[PDB]
Design a protein around this nucleic acid. Structure first.
Lengths: 24, 103, 111, 48, 124
RNA sequence: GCGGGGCUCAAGCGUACCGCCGAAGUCGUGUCAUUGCGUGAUGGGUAGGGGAGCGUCGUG
RNA sequence: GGAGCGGAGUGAAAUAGUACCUGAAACCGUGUGCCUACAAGCCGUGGGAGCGUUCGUGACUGC
């Protein structure tokens, strides 16, 4: 499959927030 | 207390000393005095609404300023045809200070 | 007492660098070294090397030897000049590969 | 006084008429440049 | 004489994007997508600016009707009575009395009630 | 298969009576423009016709 | 370790440091004022309370 639309800035950043490291 | 006056096809609520904005009175220069036809007078509990009584009451006001309002930007548009008319407008106004409300 | 250092053209993608720099914002300077020390990520090595220049500048240049009243005031990673190379793939085509770089800055101030 | 200087020359009114630049903008001779749509005359000349 | 169309083209680009400062997402960064929207913003301005006159008159009738029913006269007939007393006073300010000066509006319903015909449904 | 809620304690159909709401229509107020003789008319608009201009570069 | 950087110095100017005159936009970040976790949004526009380093934001509501 292929992305139907360019992802809106809000939606892109909602997700990348989840890609965070944990404090040891 | 205050009186209702018509100033160019528009009504207003005015008390002595108020500065109000009205459609341009082209005949009057700055400092001139203009009489406004009153439509209601409220003085405490006394409400004067008889038109025959009111026909003799004229609210006296002084022409304070001639100025122009903010600029309004106008656009006509219809899609897929290329029609587009752009236009600007600044409505001209006169500020008058109410001086007297004869009883 | 703002003293700062930065490493420019550090070969690690900006997002991978931000993953680590977002841990060390607003903690004691020494306590931040003890966090980058025990950090799995491989970006924690260049970042801690910059965090030590900031403390070294604070001690030397501005004479704030005591490195225990310091906290990370600012820390941010800026994008750097991207390099562009290709990769042969199926049926004679080629897809581009960008080797991104970053500019890491760290600022230590007195509490 | 102040005789004729070379920056005082102006043409007789109505002498020079400004050109008609077709194809610039839609508030002028617009996209079609006064030709219509898709005929032999929308791209070419029809002999008399 | 070649003309580089950069000093001239940017003149309108900044104008649109200055009008576009505020739009959410991509309508406030990109000239093309911002210039499709400031067209819609101006057309809506025109319609709503001409259609708030009836919007505000609707709000005035609501207030006049609410206050008139507090004094036991429906807005249907409180207006007719006012006509038959030649005390025409704009709704703009007739609704400004109901809120602040209840007495004055109460004094005007009295006039409107006495200016009505005795039996309101009999043939004119 | 009322736009929905609800409606026969009609908020349904019929016939009279009274009133009101309702548009960029008309009137009121201010202002600009085309055209004919202060005044009359006029100013939605695609294809298209005519007119008046803004901006960029260069030359005298 | 180096790269690179912080002081110092040259320079009129070092966000003129041999990646170097001017340094726009897309794009990527830090801080900060406002709003945002019962809400259906061609993302605007009219009305409008509140908050705040006319201005910034925009609860709620009409189109």
């Amino acid at each position: 499959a292929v992305p139907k639309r360019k992802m809106s800035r809000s939606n892109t950043r909602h997700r990348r927030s989840q890609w965070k490291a944990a404090v040891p | 207390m205050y009186a209702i006056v018509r100033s160019g096809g528009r009504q207003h609520k005015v008390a002595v000393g108020d500065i109000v904005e009205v459609d341009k009175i082209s005949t009057a220069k700055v400092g001139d005095t203009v009489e406004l036809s009153t439509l209601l007078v409220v003085d405490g509990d006394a409400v004067t609404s008889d038109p025959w009584v009111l026909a003799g009451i004229k609210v006296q006001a002084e022409v304070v300023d001639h100025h122009k309002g903010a600029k309004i930007d106008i656009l006509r548009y219809k899609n897929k045809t290329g029609y587009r008319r752009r236009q600007g407008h600044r409505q001209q106004y006169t500020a008058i200070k109410v001086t007297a409300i004869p009883t | 007492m703002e003293a700062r250092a930065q490493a420019r053209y550090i070969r690690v993608t900006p997002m991978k660098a931000r993953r680590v720099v977002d841990l060390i914002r607003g903690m004691d300077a020494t306590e931040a070294q003890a966090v980058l020390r025990f950090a799995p990520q491989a970006a924690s090595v260049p970042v801690k090397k910059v965090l030590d220049s900031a403390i070294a500048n604070a001690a030397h240049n501005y004479d704030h030897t005591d490195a225990s009243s310091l906290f990370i005031s600012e820390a941010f990673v800026d994008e750097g000049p991207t390099l562009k190379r290709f990769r042969p793939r199926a049926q004679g085509r080629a897809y581009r590969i960008r080797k991104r770089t970053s500019h890491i800055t760290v600022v230590v101030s007195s509490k | 006084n102040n005789p004729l200087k070379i920056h005082n020359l102006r043409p007789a009114p109505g002498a020079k008429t400004a050109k008609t630049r077709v194809g610039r903008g839609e508030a002028s001779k617009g996209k079609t440049a006064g030709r219509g749509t898709k005929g032999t005359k929308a791209r070419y000349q029809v002999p008399e | 004489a070649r003309v580089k169309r950069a000093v001239n083209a940017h003149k309108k680009r900044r104008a649109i994007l200055e009008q576009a400062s505020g739009y959410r997402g991509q309508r406030s960064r990109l000239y093309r997508k911002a210039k499709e929207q400031v067209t819609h913003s101006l057309v809506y301005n025109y319609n709503d600016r001409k259609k708030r006159k009836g919007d505000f008159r609707q709000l005035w009738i609501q207030r006049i009707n609410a206050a008139a029913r507090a004094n036991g006269i429906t807005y249907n007939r409180f207006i007719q009575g006012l006509k038959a007393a030649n005390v025409e006073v704009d709704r703009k300010i007739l609704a400004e009395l109901a809120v602040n000066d209840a007495n004055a509006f109460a004094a005007l319903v009295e006039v409107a009630q006495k200016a009505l015909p005795s039996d309101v449904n009999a043939p004119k």
